[PDB]
Amino acid sequence: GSSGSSGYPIGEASILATFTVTEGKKKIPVADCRVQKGQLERHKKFKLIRNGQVIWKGSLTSLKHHKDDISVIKTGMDCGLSLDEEKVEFKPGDQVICYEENKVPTKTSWDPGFSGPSSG
């Protein structure tokens, strides 16, 4: 039916590499993506975009920032997420949009602002 609820993307993450992991015996697939913009919150929903099409849609099952049970992933931070639907597969050419499903904001504020001088 309807693809994507009324809302907005919290942060976009691209998959640089993809691999699998072992836990006890099973083999859980993992996807390494580097937050290019925004952050990833271990709660919201996610989806894997490959070639522009979505393959998996929903919330992750687990998230880790390399030996560190974190919840939020800032920018420039590498983290690996795994989907419950092992069926789904990733690749170094997909996208991970972490949006919120509930409603849509109104956005009532417009004002630019930048800063980044040079030193040394």
Curated annotation (Swiss-Prot):
Disulfide bonds: none annotated. Coiled coil: none annotated. It is found in: Mitochondrion. The modification Phosphothreonine is found at residue 75. Monomer. Belongs to the TRAFAC class translation factor GTPase superfamily. Classic translation factor GTPase family. IF-2 subfamily. One of the essential components for the initiation of protein synthesis. Protects formylmethionyl-tRNA from spontaneous hydrolysis and promotes its binding to the 30S ribosomal subunits. Also involved in the hydrolysis of GTP during the formation of the 70S ribosomal complex. This is Translation initiation factor IF-2, mitochondrial. It comes from Mus musculus (Mouse). The chain holds residues 621 to 727 of 727 of the full protein.
